[PDB]
Write a protein that binds this ligand. Sequence first.
Ligand SMILES: [Mg+2]
Ligand SMILES: [Mg+2]
Lengths: 308, 312
Amino acid sequence: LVPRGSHMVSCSAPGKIYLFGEHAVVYGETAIACAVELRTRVRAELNDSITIQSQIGRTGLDFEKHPYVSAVIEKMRKSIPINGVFLTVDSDIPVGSGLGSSAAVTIASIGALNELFGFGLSLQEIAKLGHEIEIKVQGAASPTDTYVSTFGGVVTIPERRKLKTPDCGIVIGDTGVFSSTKELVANVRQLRESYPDLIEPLMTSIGKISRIGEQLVLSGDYASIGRLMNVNQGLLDALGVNILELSQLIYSARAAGAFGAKITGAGGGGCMVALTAPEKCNQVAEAVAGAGGKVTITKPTEQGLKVD
Amino acid sequence: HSSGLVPRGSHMVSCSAPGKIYLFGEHAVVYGETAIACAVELRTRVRAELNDSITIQSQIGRTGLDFEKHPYVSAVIEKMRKSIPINGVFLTVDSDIPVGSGLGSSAAVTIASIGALNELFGFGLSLQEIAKLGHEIEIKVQGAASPTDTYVSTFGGVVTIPERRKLKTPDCGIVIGDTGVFSSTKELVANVRQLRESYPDLIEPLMTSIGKISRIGEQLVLSGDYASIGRLMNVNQGLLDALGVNILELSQLIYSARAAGAFGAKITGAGGGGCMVALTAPEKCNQVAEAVAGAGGKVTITKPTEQGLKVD
Ligand SMILES: [Mg+2]
Ligand SMILES: [Mg+2]
């Protein structure tokens, strides 16, 4: 094959929302993720030393300001030497939120170095490597985020089967309220401990939504996907992870015609998501904006990691 | 209290009957599940005196017997006349109960009226007979009804439905917050019935989970663990939100009540508007009411009532 050893290479990897079933996976259940068109992009250039540039600054190998890129380099250079590289990182995935910001930079960086230095990694090896980098950086991590970012589209969890991509707009509304992903996993579990006979069946019912929903994703019945999303949001409210500002955004989106709307990610703050007809995306976005949410307008993405 | 004068012969008689909120389980009873209702200290009072004709006076004005303007009082007099003559009577109706949200305004006027004529004319009816009669009256006036509203207004306190088991009354304030948003009970019941129709394998187990709440919560009422009763009311609220009967105004009031320290807060009755309810420590009642008021609601501060129908 054609040498490309000096070719500047850019890779991108998407963030993701949950159609159903966040919070339920740890307790054995099925969920359905959808990658979206908000990407982190990483361009890799041959260089005499290691330089990493992003909105945070220009560094060398710096595990404090550039933890993920730095960990990727540290791990891959054990296989094939990396004498030098200039990496430039830019992201359209909103700073913090279950949308997969650290998984996207991890996967894009692996992609870009894979290409530039010829590691010949397949997508499955990339996903597993990414998972490994998040463990190294965070202490402990679920493989789901790096897998969805790698392969893109709609993915059932944890069987990892690809479902047809819906032709819908996605509005993300950020409440601007901070919450700890650990503290909320901690409270779901606790309420679960105090009333086991009540809370266990609820996770079971969220699991059921994905099984019903799989079938609606296949037939493109977005109106029913939306009705289920709404049911799932109510189950999340029963689990204790909703707040007033999330309901505020959710109810505006629904009133403006969204198929459905729900928390995406851990809850307690952060973002909600609305699934809309493409021709109604703007109107839902304006209603969420009107209500004070920080709005991003996006759509599902068919591809995961890609050489741009 | 009273005047130095003691009347001779026949006196004015007075009965009152309470409204109610649901601690748990609205919407699930019609699906074979348990609920817990709690009668509260908001009453309809009916005063009654012998008269040669019929006169009914209430917040709407003074009439003779009148099935449009006083449909329940007039149906009561009509039904009761079939066993004992009522040549005439003068009836005055007043009430502290707000309309709708299954708070039980119709049930309260029905039961208070029955109770007042019971006393005045010496019908000798027991509580069970009074509730059964009130159930029969609601059927007559609106076409169809469950016996629950009239049962709970007759007996008062905390009652499990449909098993009708009396539970110990809790020592808590109750704040009712009205969103002022109008919605219709039979439309919401229909919309819930439709959702269960579309996903029976999803929705039937959620009903079953609301029934579990009442099961667990019965024991918490027995042991007076109000904090956990609130926490379970919080879970039942998310399940009502899953059933599609919440709205933004209700959420606004509910979060405000919880931030101000309520043990818990939730929709009471049909939803889609109407009222929510918060259970609070007696201390924190004013705190919670001011905050629901602060967030947009018409607030009523009450507490549970131990009995239902009483001769005042
Ligand atoms: Mg980094
Ligand atoms: Mg009447």
